[PDB]
């Protein structure tokens, strides 16, 4: 299904720098149209996100579409395998659906025949002007094997690091996830963020999911027995019990590799 996503910038904890850069990248063509004309600048055709899994790359792509009131079409790399007019149909349907965000996920799987499913993509990209109102986003967990062709000018205009959250970003991820939930005053998300160094945004969300299930199940069971003869809250002890099944999903070894790659790009 193709639709405007309901994810906003507010649902995304941390990454405040990346967010302002992305807003300007899409707001400037429409907010200062007379200045984009005077100096002869073309709006951007795409970006590429990279980083450890579960840290917000898909969320950012959806929030960009919600910003532009645009449709979102998501395509996972492995499923382009049956077959090179596959690459052509997708660009048609995205052009049909304009203004549209076209998101290529798991592009590490294609970086490894398949040699020019890539080449069919580069040709669709050059053949599609910015006047078509399609904005391309890719993501990958394997920045080491990115073909630099997809980044030459006229294609994806920026490569952007989305890292594991630091301590302040973990507090924000926790708050954004719980923003419309009834949380008890005895829970200290700043202490929770301290105890979860190395956790991804997805790892943090699961803790929030379990703690909520625990309070709802407890609500069920207690009314069932008071049946024998006031909105309930998610309490500190629900979070205490959710933490038992909590451990990092990204290894210290992969983090080093990601940090080397990004630090050498200074
Ligand atoms: N920065 C973040 N803020 C809030 N939630 C997050 C963040 N990053 C990840 N999550 C949680 O983890 C899930 C997976 O995030 P996703 O963006 O799909 O990861 P990937 O970087 O692999 O695209 C999200 O749906 C959300 O629940
Ligand atoms: C899929 N697993 C095993 C393979 N893998 C890497 O080799 C890797 C990790 C981080 C990097 F920054 C990088 F360039 C490469 C990713 C994790
Ligand atoms: Na990922």
From Swiss-Prot:
Mutagenesis or variant effect for residue 106 to Q: Does not inhibit interaction with RHBDD1. Increased interaction with CAV1 and UBXN6. Impaired autophagic function. Defect in ubiquitin-dependent protein degradation by the proteasome
Post-translational modification N6-succinyllysine, affected residues: 185
Binding site for ATP 2: 54-59
Compartments where located: Cytoplasm, Cytosol; Endoplasmic reticulum; Nucleus; Cytoplasm, Stress granule
Post-translational modification: Phosphorylated by tyrosine kinases in response to T-cell antigen receptor activation. Phosphorylated in mitotic cells. ISGylated.
Similarity comment: family membership: Belongs to the AAA ATPase family.
UniProt comment concerning the protein's domains: The PIM (PUB-interaction motif) motif mediates interaction with the PUB domain of RNF31.
Associated disorder: Inclusion body myopathy with early-onset Paget disease with or without frontotemporal dementia 1: An autosomal dominant disease characterized by disabling muscle weakness clinically resembling to limb girdle muscular dystrophy, osteolytic bone lesions consistent with Paget disease, and premature frontotemporal dementia. Clinical features show incomplete penetrance.
Function: Necessary for the fragmentation of Golgi stacks during mitosis and for their reassembly after mitosis. Involved in the formation of the transitional endoplasmic reticulum (tER). The transfer of membranes from the endoplasmic reticulum to the Golgi apparatus occurs via 50-70 nm transition vesicles which derive from part-rough, part-smooth transitional elements of the endoplasmic reticulum (tER). Vesicle budding from the tER is an ATP-dependent process.
Annotated protein name in UniProt: Transitional endoplasmic reticulum ATPase
UniProt organism field: Homo sapiens
Gene: VCP
Coverage span on the entire protein: 468 to 763 of 806
